[PDB]
């Protein structure tokens, strides 16, 4: 519930998208996919996670529409 999955960005933009999501809380940890267009972000609180979730469908960096959903990777 502190964890979210941010997706929809190319590998070249990953670190740009992380700094954008770092705005919404002091991220503890993030895990990047090998192939995929996604990362799992652990915030400090539900409230921070909720601010990240509210950005689902929003455009970042003029041209990257971003998905955000509750993290379901148990494993992580």
């Amino acid at each position, epitope marked *: 519930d502190s964890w979210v999955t941010v997706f929809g960005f190319p590998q070249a933009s990953a*670190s740009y998208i992380l*700094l954008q999501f*770092a705005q919404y809380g002091n991220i*503890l*940890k993030h895990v990047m996919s090998n192939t995929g267009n996604w990362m799992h972000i652990r915030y400090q609180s539900k409230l921070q996670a909720r601010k990240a979730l509210s950005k689902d469908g929003r455009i970042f960096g003029e041209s990257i529409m971003i998905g955000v959903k509750p993290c379901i990777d148990k494993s992580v």
Partner: nanobody
Amino acid sequence: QLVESGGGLVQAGGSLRLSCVGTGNISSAYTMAWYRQAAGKEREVVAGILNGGSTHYADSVKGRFTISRDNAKNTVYLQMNSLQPEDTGVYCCHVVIESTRFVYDHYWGQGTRVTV
């Protein structure tokens, strides 16, 4: 751990260099970034060294602010110029470090107050 300094009162128009020093080595950082939050406002990234060493700046600070680092001193810097009252807020430094493949730990300073 990260400890920021260099904050305080400048007058509108002036220059100021913020510092953040790491207790452990930060030379392999994935990213380094400075954030600010003015009272009753959302936090915003002001300057970032992206992975590979490209930079991102908030539109409001483009051409006025520079993010740099000294590997030897284990320090990150934010050079600020032509400071405006809107630059007022708590600034904090952010360092991300890969532990195991695809797993990244995040480090945050306590913040430093800037008042223009």
